[PDB]
Ligand binder design. Sequence first.
Ligand SMILES: NC(=O)c1cc([N+](=O)[O-])c(NCCCC(=O)O)cc1NCc1cccnc1
Length: 294
Amino acid sequence: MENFQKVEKIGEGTYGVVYKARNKLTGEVVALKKIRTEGVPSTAIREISLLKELNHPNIVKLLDVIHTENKLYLVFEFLHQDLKKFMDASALTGIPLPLIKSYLFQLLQGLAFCHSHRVLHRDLKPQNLLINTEGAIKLADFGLARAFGVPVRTYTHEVVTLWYRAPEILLGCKYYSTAVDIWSLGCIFAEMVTRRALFPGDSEIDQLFRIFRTLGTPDEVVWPGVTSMPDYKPSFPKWARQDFSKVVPPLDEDGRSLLSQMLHYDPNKRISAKAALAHPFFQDVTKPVPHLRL
Ligand SMILES: NC(=O)c1cc([N+](=O)[O-])c(NCCCC(=O)O)cc1NCc1cccnc1
């Protein structure tokens, strides 16, 4: 990197390698992502470029989109840890409820902002949620999925996780709505509470069936139009819905109520980020600081 001294390899993203780097001129420390074949789609350039204006305190800031030497680099503000690592590290005692609530509240503010500007994430997961020592949490990679697509395998053959995928996506819908992000966030909220992934599928059908086994196989009553979806099969087994009290114990009724609205099958009935922010669950929200050992 000409203007960047590579500090460390942060990981192998969905699109390419990500490095923590230091701008040799300003000294600012950033996250530099090298995106993957030959020519760089011009449409992706314009689209990604527009994201430079999508600024909000709970959205990882896109500092620059470098299209030089016919290669694509994205420069992002740097945060020291992601939620996946934090959850793993908090697995023995669990993340305290006040912090889970603060993070969920901040994540919803972030979604509310992007959604009002017509930008969707589409692939939210704990690894895409970044946190700092101040108690803030931010969403990373908003809008990139649209600029590219679903790779199935990152770039190093790693398997892309399906655990947070909305059911309308699994059923073949071609047009995603903002509801897909609320679904993923609901799945993450449940994982923070129980300390185990809600729907850890290892194939598209296993993912769909794990959802059906917990929330019941969807039908025309709860989801008008579901039986006409591209990948819907009348042969899907019919499972009864389980009670949330059994799905995310020992979360209280305000939390179960909100989660239930974030996991509604019908994308149109699923709660919006804006409405979720007004839910009684956030009546006593605060902003605690996490125990972060960097
Ligand atoms: N913008 C960023 O600061 C950042 C970007 C990406 N990413 O662009 O991908 C990322 N990968 C998420 C890791 C995904 C994984 O392999 O599990 C993590 C980040 N920071 C948190 C962090 C975490 C660990 C070490 N150091 C910093």
